[PDB]
Amino acid sequence: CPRFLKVKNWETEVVLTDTLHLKSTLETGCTEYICMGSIMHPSQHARRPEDVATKDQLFPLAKEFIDQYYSSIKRFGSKAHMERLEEVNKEIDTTSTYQLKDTELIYGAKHAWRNASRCVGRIQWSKLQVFDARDCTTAHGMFNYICNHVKYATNKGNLRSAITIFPQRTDGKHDFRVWNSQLIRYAGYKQPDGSTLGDPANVQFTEICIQQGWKPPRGRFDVLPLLLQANGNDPELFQIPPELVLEVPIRHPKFEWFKDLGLKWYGLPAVSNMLLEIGGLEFSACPFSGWYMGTEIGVRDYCDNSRYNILEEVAKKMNLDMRKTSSLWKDQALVEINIAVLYSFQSDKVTIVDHHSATESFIKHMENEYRCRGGCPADWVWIVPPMSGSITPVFHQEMLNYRLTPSFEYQPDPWNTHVWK
């Protein structure tokens, strides 16, 4: 690979020079003859519960991370650096794994976020509260840690980014897993007539919860129970205390009828099914939370045809001409729904960011990373917002996408792999 790669911003003519791509250690999925940039889950962005490192695989992955850590604290080559290398190597030799120091765990989690090429929110990466839950042994203990996380991160609406890290993978038969895809999500219920009540995206998981014993209220916005797996055991159900679940009723500054739609959303997005990889170690349960960009709710959750799918009903109440696509009735209603989401979160003093502010901040972050770090991996397909793409600055920004470690990765859904006791 060439030593310097340039990216151009076609609106400002700013040219940035990337050298950090030379440190890439993981594959993207593309080849020299095909680009897979729009594939959602290439196998290179995933981790199966089985590519558990052997001793020999683990040694160089650990050294690479330890070297990167001691380089960051300006102690590369120090006595402490060499002693830590030797301690880790002895641990891998005698136990086939090793334990991160608290300092290294925090560094690793922050950098997995810093390295997440699909995240537009990374200007915040160094402000992450890391909760060490590696002493957890039971699903009840996981519930405790998760409740404390939710309460801390919610902070009565002044949201604070946080991650809780449960024990790392050992032999693959003792995994900790949060079976939920997010800590807070709404149930979906398939009806005998083919319609769906609630959130269609969560129908499969809802059915699992019901099979495990959950009694469903069968409403439109039912918060799902936690389904928590500790030490490879069968998962167990817990209800999050409702006072810990902050929600926002959606209303519109101009349209008084918008509140009659009965819409609401939860304030805290907390992804709970990804895998955190640090120095070859695999943290299969690592729920992390930030705050929302408004389009996540107003465009995707509400307006995707496969989700709540509200464009028609909103357009009807707006008295729009819906008989031709070229009236752009869908586009008009989409904007008004996203106005409503931002207005409702701001009115209730729940942290949220609009897509103009978020992408403008991301450009500033990217430029700083190029200047201070030598680059910033970014996935244009994910960074550009799902509405009004070209009136945001990231649309015009060339980006380079590549995979650095530590990293967040996808992993198979646990019900597809779990061996029931």
Next chain:
Amino acid sequence: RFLKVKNWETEVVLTDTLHLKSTLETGCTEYICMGSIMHPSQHARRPEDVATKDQLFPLAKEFIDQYYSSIKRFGSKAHMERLEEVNKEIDTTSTYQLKDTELIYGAKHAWRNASRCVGRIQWSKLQVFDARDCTTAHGMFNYICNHVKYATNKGNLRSAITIFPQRTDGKHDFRVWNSQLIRYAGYKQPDGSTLGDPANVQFTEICIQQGWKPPRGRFDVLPLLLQANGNDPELFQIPPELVLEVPIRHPKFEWFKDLGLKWYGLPAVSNMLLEIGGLEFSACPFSGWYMGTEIGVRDYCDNSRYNILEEVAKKMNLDMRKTSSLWKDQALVEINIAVLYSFQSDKVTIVDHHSATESFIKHMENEYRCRGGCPADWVWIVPPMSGSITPVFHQEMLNYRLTPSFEYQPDPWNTHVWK
């Protein structure tokens, strides 16, 4: 290996085998993705990279083979004779000439293979004008006038391409210096701002230096600047009756007409390079019709173009003090309603981004069934507004390079030695 692409809205999975036929590079590697880079080295053609006899026969052979495979006569007597005829011609002249059937097939397939074009459901309906006998800029003017008249068709636009003589030694290139046949001038003002289209300031300055008398307005149609056989380019005025324009008005906002906006009906790209069988056609203006967002989102609302969001939101009496009011997004939709309404009212062909992306999904389905795949660049296919409420946003695409193809080339004023 076979590669699968999934639509995450409809769960339709398609299986791509056509990518196995590409030999050109993408710019990506196993360790870096360049999918959002606008002009990687792999989508451009420099004049110095002229082909030699040695490079040209395998490229010619590949193209003849796929042509005769396409008419289901691979290995036939005609196929054998054509390969021998082409071989002798490269040998004795360092190049070869396409048959008329091959030129048409090659131009249609360059369009079919254009991974960034959402309009490709139309690919087999393309009028091909053979201009390979042209020798002078006056001849180029005539061919281009005939193209504009044919394609405009009084508003019932018809896709067309005019193909001028191929590159020989690189010192005798035919070039249209305009980026599109019809574009509006842009002028740097004393106070540092730009009048007209900022995208065309440099080309406008060259026309002025060459003697064009500028009206210094907001929507002045530029003259044609035409280069034949490597000679200095010459200026020509397209006859105004041939230039179809649309004044922009809004169906509800009667004040919108007072913005004084207009656009032209015929998008006609004239600075790309057509590559067929190793031959390079450096002047190949091609035209279709607009998707509304090209004008309403990019031309009018890019900060670096006409940049009208603030004026429109002013007339809409929107609160512009905070971005979270989405005042830009509101004005953006109303501008794009006006563009579509105005073309439709004047019976000028245009497609909205909902209809266009819907047609592209159907096109992909067609191509996967009959051809084994469809190269597509998500970054370009997804429209610049309302992305995820169009079906292509949810469609995984594979991007790969097939030939014949359209490629970028350097602007002629960076290469040209003036005699």
